[PDB]
Design a protein around this ligand. Structure first.
Ligand SMILES: Cc1cc2nc3c(=O)[nH]c(=O)nc-3n(C[C@H](O)[C@H](O)[C@H](O)COP(=O)(O)O)c2cc1C
Ligand code: SF4
Ligand code: SF4
Ligand code: SF4
Ligand code: FES
Ligand code: FES
Ligand SMILES: [K+]
Lengths: 213, 263, 44, 430
């Protein structure tokens, strides 16, 4: 929750970080996406790649990203503290992100937050003592008609009730992986009482095309 | 030539293309209130104190960054220009600490002076203020980041003039903090000039700290001898004793900077 | 046949943590050479 | 046409909106995408920009600027620097979840829109700035872009027209301010997503200092359909200067929260009662509706009875159309708590660059948090009005406007609820 750093014995500039060689080839592919002379444009994807490899960002992933892109380390520290996905503390293995903005709050995301809390025994911001779950409270995740919903490390679990999210936490404690979708009957975003549109077969190529084209 | 004509409060003035609104008002002798604009740094546009009305335009423009068009009438003393200035001064003083008596910037503060000139005279702020953790950047610059008004003259100085690239903003929103993010010791040869261009008491001189106060000092315009550049300096004395050294502007030598040995 | 009752986007149930980056690495060859500003960085 | 709405499936641009068909290339070609694309590319930039100007397309991002007039700012001879189309796929707006549906379910339509819109402005490549939380959607779009490269549709000699056009995907990292066009440009360049001042406009100095148009997913994805079906077809829908179809997100307190495509100038009551299954508890249970996502001011049930869901009817209704993300609120809602949670969003999603939003959105969060409990006096309502008017029109970008407008809508339509909240606070805590 702090935006200054202090060198702890588990987070210091001599904490061992290095990319795997297949991640060096991934960083080559990332840096080739941007124009020559603008290698600093790959600060966000390579830092996300370092977080995906390591689970979180020590201050050696930031220094390695500054070392392999030839940018100042302060200009990587700015990006790492600005964006709210870069975990500068070690988070749990399943990082649960409950949305509590107004379209999810109106559809009772507080009951889901309370269900996750009394299932895990933690509160907002805490990590479980076995380092499996970190429950934080996030802003709008962009799945608003599927409210209420959480995100667990990559995956959107949508249309949730307390029973649905407790079943998800059960099968995440069981070592399995759940299916990322709406936990009600519907599939992605349609009206739940059947399709109110797009029931007819779509037309295909050549339909309605103007002349001379 | 290709000089275009702009009007500043009706007064006609011929400016070069690419001239900002602030420089157009300067050419008729009106100094627009600024906090993040500095004529030797890059333009930031992020304090919004220079907001001025152009007439027949339903929006104030940031005069430090806005290039003039032909035939603009700049209204530096209009009603909504003054409302913009009072609002921005209100937001700057919303979270600013009540530290003026214990502050070395008191009496020589931009925030005090153009709060007296352009701000309102009382507060509507009824909440708790933020308080920022203090940083440590060496034995020269006393750092009290609660007074920081986030104008980024730090960062533009250390980036473009000192060439160090080690100050920056961490965080986001009202919790945005200026610093090095680590326990780093900002020791340049020009590092004491961030005390000059900080408009507030956030970066003060640690050797000078608490000893004097600007209204009681005598300004003796003198010359550096610590090298062969010959930087023009002000030797401020108080009751027969030298208190600190400040630069003089001299465009051909030291433009308005001095080194840390000099300072 | 025409089907409208199944959800055809079932491929993202198998995406790993490196799916995006491996697709970038696979697309690294299909692209045009990037334009250069003439210098190596704006600090060069 | 005096009555709008009731849009048929032959006129829906976004077929396979619901994921009910194959999103891949063999599905997208069988629904109409990538048809006669070489003939669109070979008719030049000016024909395509004329078909976008004639169609009356406005920007779907929330500003609503005329899209053909916007894209013709790039229709200018090169000066050595490349040109870049940039697709705004951030979509951090509360209520808004439609570009997720376009990218997740119709990705080749977005790729063909990138190709057509980049040919129209002479762009070298396309950088799609997708939301970093949309990881499955990003890999979904990446499989589609690999399918469009391997079919020769983009890349070297795109669609066989002698045009070289790359399409990139840049993932964000969790900041709502990176949906603003200049801050998105700053985030592609590898910095903090902090907006630029204008001038320079992105068509002069944009991403990497090149000429650049930033455009929404939806206004890019409809452009091949506007080219194929014609501009007059797309301009036959909605009112004049409000032309076309639109994805509407109805969420909140409705029975069936949904993404739906619908004609532009549809009534809001018809949209809710036709595609969403009504307000929970009937239309008489309606309290307020935020019409277009969080940046637009709310309008109460008396305004929502006859309002039309395009730009002009909502601007005259002292609100905005925005992203057209309909948040529906019933009479069982603490509306001051909802607007306070929305202002809490706007201070946790604000890049902190300039003074009015950085200081005043936090100070509005503090005043709204006291208004929820009632720990206030009725002079502070007008005080909060003047604070919101000091933020509006004074910031660098429009997150200050978008954080001032909900406060203004709440005060303007619900001053009595604030007053009775505070006076019952006074008569039970003193
Ligand atoms: C705070 C803020 C957030 C924005 N977020 C988005 C967004 O998520 N998606 C989007 O398309 N436009 C967003 N915009 C609007 C863009 O600035 C811009 O208008 C748009 O992306 C491109 O123009 P267009 O509407 O013609 O597509 C946002 C604007 C602001 C001020
Ligand atoms: S910096 Fe200026 S306004 Fe702030 S406490 Fe010091 S003298 Fe007062
Ligand atoms: S410390 Fe001073 S110069 Fe630096 S950003 Fe803050 S107010 Fe500006
Ligand atoms: S309005 Fe808010 S989010 Fe935008 S540049 Fe200013 S402080 Fe940043
Ligand atoms: S409000 Fe929770 S996802 Fe948008
Ligand atoms: S002086 Fe122009 S905005 Fe700071
Ligand atoms: K100072």
């Amino acid at each position: 929750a702090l935006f200054v750093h202090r060198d702890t014995p588990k987070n210091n500039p001599e904490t061992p970080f290095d990319f795997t060689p297949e991640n060096y080839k991934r960083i080559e592919a990332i840096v080739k996406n941007y124009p020559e002379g603008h290698k600093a444009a790959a600060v966000l994807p390579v830092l996300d790649l370092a977080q995906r490899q390591n689970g979180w960002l020590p201050i050696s992933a930031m220094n390695k990203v500054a070392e392999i892109l030839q940018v100042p380390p302060m200009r990587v520290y700015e990006v790492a503290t600005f964006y709210t996905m870069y975990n500068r503390k070690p988070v749990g293995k399943y990082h649960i992100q409950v949305c509590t903005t107004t379209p999810c709050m109106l559809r009772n995301s507080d009951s889901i937050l309370e269900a996750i809390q009394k299932k895990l025994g933690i509160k907002v911001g805490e990590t479980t003592p076995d380092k499996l779950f970190t429950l934080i409270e996030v802003e709008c995740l962009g799945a608003c008609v599927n409210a209420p919903m959480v995100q667990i490390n990559d995956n959107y679990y949508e249309d949730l009730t307390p029973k649905d999210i407790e079943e998800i936490i059960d099968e995440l404690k069981a070592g399995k992986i759940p299916k990322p979708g709406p936990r009600s009957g519907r599939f992605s975003c349609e009206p739940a009482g059947g399709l109110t549109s797009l029931t007819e077969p779509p037309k295909g190529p050549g339909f309605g095309v103007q002349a001379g084209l | 030539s290709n000089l275009i004509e702009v009007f500043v409060d009706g007064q006609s003035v011929m400016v070069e293309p690419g001239t900002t609104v602030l420089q157009a008002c300067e050419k008729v002798g009106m100094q627009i209130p600024r906090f993040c604009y500095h004529e030797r740094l890059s333009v930031a546009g992020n304090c919004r104190m220079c907001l001025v009305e152009i007439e027949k335009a339903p929006k104030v423009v940031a005069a430090c960054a806005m290039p003039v068009m032909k035939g603009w009438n700049i209204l530096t003393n209009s009603e909504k220009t003054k409302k913009a200035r009072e609002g921005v001064m209100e937001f700057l003083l919303a979270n600013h600490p009540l530290d003026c008596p214990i502050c070395d910037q008191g009496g020589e503060c931009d925030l005090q002076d153009q709060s007296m000139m352009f701000g309102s005279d009382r507060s509507r702020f009824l909440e708790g203020k933020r308080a920022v953790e203090d940083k440590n950047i060496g034995p020269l610059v006393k750092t009290i980041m609660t007074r920081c008004i986030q104008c980024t003259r730090c960062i533009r100085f250390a980036s473009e003039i000192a060439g160090v690239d080690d100050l920056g903003t961490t965080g986001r929103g009202n919790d945005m903090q200026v610093g090095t993010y680590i326990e780093k010791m900002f020791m340049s040869e020009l590092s004491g000039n961030i005390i000059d261009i900080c408009p507030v008491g956030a970066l003060t001189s640690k050797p000078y700290a608490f000893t004097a106060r600007p209204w009681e000092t005598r300004k003796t315009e003198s010359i550096d001898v610590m090298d062969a550049v010959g930087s023009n300096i002000v030797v401020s004395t108080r009751t027969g004793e030298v208190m600190r050294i400040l630069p003089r502007m001299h465009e051909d030598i030291n433009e308005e900077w001095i080194s840390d040995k000099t300072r | 046949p025409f089907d409208n009752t199944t959800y055809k986007n079932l491929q993202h149930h198998d995406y790993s943590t490196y799916t995006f980056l491996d697709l970038n690495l696979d697309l690294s060859k299909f692209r045009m050479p990037q334009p250069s500003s003439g210098r190596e960085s704006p600090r060069h | 046409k005096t009555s709008f709405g009731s849009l048929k499936d032959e006129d829906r641009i976004f077929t396979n909106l619901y994921g009910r068909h194959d999103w891949r290339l063999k599905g997208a070609q069988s629904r109409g995408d990538w048809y006669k694309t070489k003939e669109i590319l070979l008719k030049g930039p000016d024909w395509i920009l004329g078909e976008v100007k004639t169609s009356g397309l406005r920007g779907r991002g929330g500003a609503g600027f005329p899209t053909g007039l916007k894209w013709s700012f790039m229709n200018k001879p090169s000066d050595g620097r490349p040109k870049y189309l940039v697709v705004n796929a951030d979509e951090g707006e509360p209520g808004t979840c439609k570009d997720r549906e376009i990218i997740r379910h119709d990705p080749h339509k977005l790729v063909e829109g990138c190709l057509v819109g980049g040919r129209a402005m002479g762009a070298r490549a396309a950088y799609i700035y997708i939301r970093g939380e949309f990881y499955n959607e990003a890999s979904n779009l990446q499989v589609a872009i690999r399918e469009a490269y391997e079919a020769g549709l983009i890349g070297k000699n795109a669609c066989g027209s002698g045009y070289d056009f790359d399409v990139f995907v840049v993932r964000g990292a969790g900041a709502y301010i990176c949906g603003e066009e200049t801050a998105l440009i700053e985030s592609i360049e590898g910095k903090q997503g902090k907006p630029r001042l204008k001038p320079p406009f992105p068509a002069d100095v944009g991403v990497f200092g090149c000429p650049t148009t930033v455009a929404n997913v939806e206004t890019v994805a409809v452009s091949p359909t506007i080219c194929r079906r014609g501009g007059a077809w797309f301009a036959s829908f909605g009112r004049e200067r409000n032309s076309g179809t639109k994805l509407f997100n109805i969420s909140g307190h409705v029975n069936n929260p949904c993404t739906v495509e619908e004609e532009m100038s549809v009534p809001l009551k018809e949209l809710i009662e036709k595609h969403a299954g009504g307000v929970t508890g009937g239309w008489d249970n309606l309290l307020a509706v935020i019409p277009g996502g969080s940046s637009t001011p709310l309008i109460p049930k008396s305004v929502c009875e006859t309002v039309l869901m395009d730009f002009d009817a909502l601007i005259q209704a002292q609100t905005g159309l925005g992203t057209a993300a309909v948040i529906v609120m019933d009479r069982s809602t603490d509306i001051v708590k909802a607007i306070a949670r929305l202002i809490e969003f706007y201070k946790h999603e604000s890049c902190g660059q300039c003074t009015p939003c950085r200081e005043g959105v936090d100070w509005m969060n503090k005043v709204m948090a006291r208004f929820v409990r009632g720990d206030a006096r009725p002079a502070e309502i007008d005080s909060l009005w003047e604070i919101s008017k000091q933020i509006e029109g004074h910031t660098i970008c429009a997150l200050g406007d978008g954080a001032a407008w909900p406060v203004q809508g709440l005060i303007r339509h619900f001053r009595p609820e604030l007053e009775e909240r505070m006076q019952r606070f006074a008569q039970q805590h003193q």
